[PDB]
């Protein structure tokens, strides 16, 4: 009900380490490929944790 | 033998570590992927490396 939203901005993101160490049983992406995340630039990045 | 969460990556077009540097499937692949747990046989208590 009170899920935490964190803004991610002004950083270079290496998603490869997310893959290297990962207890993440479910890794489901909707609008983008997981391996192309390292090849793209983004804004409006938000992490919602609950 | 792979990890439990890497079973999604043995598929055509998949993103991963073992998909890129260990086992690659073609885009036009036909067939079936079978995955089953092997804790009873492929694990040891001190760590099976």
Swiss-Prot record, chain B:
Residues 3-5 are annotated as: Integrin-binding motif. It comes from the Viruses. Binds to host ACE2. RBD also interacts with the N-linked glycan on 'Asn-90' of ACE2. Cleavage of S generates a polybasic C-terminal sequence on S1 that binds to host Neuropilin-1 (NRP1) and Neuropilin-2 (NRP2) receptors. Interacts with host integrin alpha-5/beta-1 (ITGA5:ITGB1) and with ACE2 in complex with integrin alpha-5/beta-1 (ITGA5:ITGB1). May interact via cytoplasmic c-terminus with M protein. May interact (via N-terminus) with host bilirubin and biliverdin, thereby preventing antibody binding to the SARS-CoV-2 spike NTD via an allosteric mechanism. Attaches the virion to the cell membrane by interacting with host receptor, initiating the infection. The major receptor is host ACE2. When S2/S2' has been cleaved, binding to the receptor triggers direct fusion at the cell membrane. When S2/S2' has not been cleaved, binding to the receptor results in internalization of the virus by endocytosis using host TFRC and GRM2 and leading to fusion of the virion membrane with the host endosomal membrane. Alternatively, may use NRP1/NRP2 and integrin as entry receptors. This is Spike protein S1. It comes from Severe acute respiratory syndrome coronavirus 2. The chain holds residues 401 to 449 of 1273 of the full protein.
């Amino acid at each position: 009900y009170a899920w935490n939203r964190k803004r991610i901005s002004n950083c270079v993101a290496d998603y490869s380490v997310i893959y290297n160490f990962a207890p993440f049983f479910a890794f489901k992406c909707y609008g983008v490929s997981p391996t192309k995340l390292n090849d793209l630039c983004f804004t409006n990045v938000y992490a919602d944790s609950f | 033998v792979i990890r439990g969460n890497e079973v999604s990556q043995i598929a055509p077009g998949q993103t991963g570590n073992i998909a890129d540097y260990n086992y690659k499937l073609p885009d036009d692949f036909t067939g079936c992927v079978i995955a089953w747990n092997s804790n009873k046989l492929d694990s040891k208590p001190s760590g099976n490396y």
